[PDB]
Amino acid sequence: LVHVASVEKGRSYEDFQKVYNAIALKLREDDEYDNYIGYGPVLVRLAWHISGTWDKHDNTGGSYGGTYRFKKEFNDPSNAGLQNGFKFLEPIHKEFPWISSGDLFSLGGVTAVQEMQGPKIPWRCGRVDTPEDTTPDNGRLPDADKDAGYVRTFFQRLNMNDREVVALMGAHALGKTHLKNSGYEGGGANNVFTNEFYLNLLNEDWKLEKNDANNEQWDSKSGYMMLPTDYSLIQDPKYLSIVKEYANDQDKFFKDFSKAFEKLLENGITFPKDAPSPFIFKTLEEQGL
Ligand code: HEM
Numbered sequence: 001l002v003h004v005a006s007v008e009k010g011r012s013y014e015d016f017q018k019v020y021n022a023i024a025l026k027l028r029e030d031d032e033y034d035n036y037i038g039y040g041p042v043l044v045r046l047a048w049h050i051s052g053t054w055d056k057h058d059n060t061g062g063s064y065g066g067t068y069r070f071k072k073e074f075n076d077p078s079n080a081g082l083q084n085g086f087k088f089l090e091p092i093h094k095e096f097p098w099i100s101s102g103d104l105f106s107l108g109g110v111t112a113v114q115e116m117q118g119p120k121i122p123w124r125c126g127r128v129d130t131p132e133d134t135t136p137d138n139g140r141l142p143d144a145d146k147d148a149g150y151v152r153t154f155f156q157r158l159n160m161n162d163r164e165v166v167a168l169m170g171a172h173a174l175g176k177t178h179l180k181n182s183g184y185e186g187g188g189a190n191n192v193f194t195n196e197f198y199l200n201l202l203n204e205d206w207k208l209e210k211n212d213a214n215n216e217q218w219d220s221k222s223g224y225m226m227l228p229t230d231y232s233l234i235q236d237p238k239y240l241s242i243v244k245e246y247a248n249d250q251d252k253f254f255k256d257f258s259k260a261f262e263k264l265l266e267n268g269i270t271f272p273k274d275a276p277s278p279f280i281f282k283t284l285e286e287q288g289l
Pocket residue numbers: 041042044045048080081142143144145151168169171172174175176177178179181182183184227229
């Protein structure tokens with residue numbers, strides 16, 4: 001099973017920067033969402049969930065097909081709450097109807113990271129919408145109530161190693177959990193991309209509590225929370241080494257995150273040798289907009 005990237009006809013860097021700008025301007029304008037967190041974090045989560053269905057064994061799932069637009073995937077209980085991100089992007093899809101669904105969902109993630117003062121993330125175009133029968137079945141996204149061994153094994157399906165896993169998990173500095181979506185609550189209200197996830201893991205006094213959905217989570221008096229899968233990063237000696245590395249080197253964390261997130265968004269896609277190089281988009285701030 002081969003998914004070959006095909007550039008939207010006649011489109012170049014300037015077309016995709018226009019789409020980035022549209023997303024970025026709406027992120028700035030629709031700022032009230034989720035108690036003034038804004039849509040940044042949910043767009044990062046959406047980019048990850050549409051990519052995180054991939055299976056390296058048979059090349060099914062992944063971002064290429066834009067299959068989240070179909071009912072089976074849209075209604076996956078693992079995707080509860082992502083409808084808010086889809087609704088955000090819908091007017092963008094209408095203004096730029098030539099962009100494929102997988103390109104738009106993945107670009108929404110890149111735009112959100114960058115606009116939240118995260119690292120630059122190189123991005124490639126050419127995902128092509130595939131039909132409804134290519135939609136992966138539910139149950140390919142990870143459970144939160146598990147341990148390190150589970151996390152490690154899970155991410156092997158996505159061809160991610162320990163360092164890639166720990167770097168990706170730093171996105172849990174962003175946004176929050178919502179009881180009605182996942183059965184976890186809390187986490188604060190952060191919408192600036194930093195390495196604080198690692199600092200918080202190492203420095204907070206964590207307590208194992210049960211929430212109103214009868215699930216266990218780790219809570220601190222500062223108002224932060226860790227999922228069991230988050231906390232497992234300090235229980236496993238290989239993960240703990242990497243947590244310490246990112247807690248002590250913001251730049252290293254940004255660079256490793258950028259590479260792992262690009263890889264996540266590109267898994268399953270074959271880029272022809274003559275494809276355009278990856279694009280690095282300017283932020284609104286860089287453009288003076
Ligand atoms: C073992 C892997 C993972 C598990 C079990 C996991 C689980 C969760 C759960 C339960 C929530 C709360 C959803 C809600 O209640 O709204 C969440 C939020 C989030 N996750 Fe993950 N996650 C994992 C990996 C990742 C990765 C790899 C990324 C991105 C690189 C990511 C980015 C986010 C973001 C940005 C939010 C906040 C969304 C919002 O504020 O609406 N997560 N995660």
